[PDB]
Design a binder for this molecule. Structure first.
Ligand SMILES: C[S+](C)(=O)CCC(=O)O
Ligand SMILES: C[S+](C)(=O)CCC(=O)O
Ligand SMILES: [Mn+2]
Ligand SMILES: [Mn+2]
Lengths: 126, 126
């Protein structure tokens, strides 16, 4: 199994979102629930201006690849700005958040060492 | 740990290359041999015009995130063009290759579900 995905390829998948996290939306691009892939899973997320992926944690390690815009990464209390061209490593169960305070949409891929997103349990930090 | 890394952040690290992959060079941005991260590892690769990452396989699944240029992905014998904005899933042990026959550099990140790149044993294929 080898395959290529982009936003055009997942046009017929609806965006995921929740009232719990205003301004945040996501799609699944490499994911066992859609593709039968395994070992790694990847999604594409957008954070609108003012949106906040609030402080949370989850057991798998995570990489984010920032593809557009800029934001403020909350590294368990220590803030650092991120932007297009950055990659982010987040250790498993490390508390992190991401806020968009710019003009552009903050867009990024996330990657988990899991077969799929839906088996990752998200916990709010507080 | 949580950290951020971009090409500028690894200026200190010389490009890696190998004779078997002409016109291919890479750096390690998230890697236990460099960072003490764990669970996922990520590098950045450039394939110069004419360069060829020849047909090979390795046991871990792999994701590629194409950030610039165009390339010809060999999917175990079936070709597909990839370009900026694409992501690629390569199942563990699936045979794959990536050629650049364009005029601009083909740039991508790769991600493995390993702590470090040196945990990935590469095998040549057909
Ligand atoms: C934008 S998502 C799909 O909630 C996942 C983002 C994250 O885990 O940091
Ligand atoms: C650029 S590398 C790390 O030599 C090979 C990348 C790959 O496994 O496809
Ligand atoms: Mn997260
Ligand atoms: Mn490979």
């Amino acid at each position: 199994m080898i395959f290529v995905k982009n936003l055009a390829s997942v046009l017929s998948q609806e965006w995921s979102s929740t009232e719990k996290y205003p301004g945040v939306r996501w799609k699944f691009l490499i994911d066992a629930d859609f593709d039968g892939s395994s070992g790694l899973s990847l999604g594409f997320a957008e954070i609108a201006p003012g949106g906040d992926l609030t402080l949370h944690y989850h057991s798998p390690a995570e990489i984010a690849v920032v593809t557009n815009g800029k934001g403020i990464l909350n590294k368990s209390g220590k803030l650092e700005t991120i932007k297009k061209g950055d990659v982010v490593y987040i250790a498993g169960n490390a508390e992190h958040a991401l806020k968009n305070n710019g003009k552009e949409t903050l867009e990024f891929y996330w990657i988990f060492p899991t077969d799929r997103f839906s088996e990752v349990e998200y916990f709010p930090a507080k």
